[PDB]
Design a protein around this nucleic acid. Structure first.
Length: 167
DNA sequence: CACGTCTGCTCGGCTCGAGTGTTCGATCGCGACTGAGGACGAACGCGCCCCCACCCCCTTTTATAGGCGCCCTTC
């Protein structure tokens, strides 16, 4: 997220902008999307904006600055204030099938495998407090992170266990 | 002025109305044994409306995947 520091007129924005859309009857924020690092932003009337989609923190800082740029170019007193990363998402694969019934058995306290509902196992780490999604093919997705190290650490913890249930 | 007669006032007798109290239909309240031989559950219960306080839901991005609805195509 980032705060622009001033109030704006989203309808004018919607009118001016070329890569945006606005619908008060649907949602309050105006939606913008740029090809740079290919991203999307949520701009509030309050002066707050949210930026998602970047594949690195520098490019997200880059994209947000680019958004602040087009807002300036509209004639508005944009300010790059209070920039902060709120979440990071990662994934990887291990290339082998795995034992999930066992994993949920041996980690009952954390796991919440629901094969009926969502196909993969939901694992809630409490180290760098991270949420993982593990699938039978071996693919793994991670979220809840604030820095890359938490992903490597959370994965560094889970990888031996997973190899240990290899089929 | 004196005596007799007519008219008006007072004492007494009578009528009427209010007051006090009896009779009688009507309503209401209370009581009615012994013991067999057990047999196990049934559920809620002015409601609605206003105020208000707090927490949920809508959107977007992405890899990941079993599930599934729509529709095009073929039999």
């Amino acid at each position: 997220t980032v705060n622009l520091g001033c109030k704006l007129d989203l309808k004018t924005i919607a009118l001016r902008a070329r890569n945006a859309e606005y619908n008060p009857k649907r949602f309050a924020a105006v939606i913008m999307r740029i090809r740079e690092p290919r991203t999307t932003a949520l701009i509030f009337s309050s002066g707050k904006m949210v930026c998602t989609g970047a594949k690195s923190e520098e490019q997200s800082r880059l994209a947000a600055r680019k958004y602040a740029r087009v807002v300036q170019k509209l004639g508005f007193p944009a300010k790059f204030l209070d920039f902060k990363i709120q979440n990071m998402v990662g994934s990887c694969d291990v290339k082998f099938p795995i034992r999930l019934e066992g994993l949920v058995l041996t980690h009952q306290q954390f796991s919440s495998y629901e094969p009926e509902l969502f196909p993969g196992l939901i694992y809630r780490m409490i180290k760098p407090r991270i949420v993982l999604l593990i699938f039978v093919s071996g693919k793994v997705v991670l979220t809840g992170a604030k820095v890359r190290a938490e992903i490597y650490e959370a994965f560094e913890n889970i990888y031996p266990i997973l190899k240990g249930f290899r089929k």
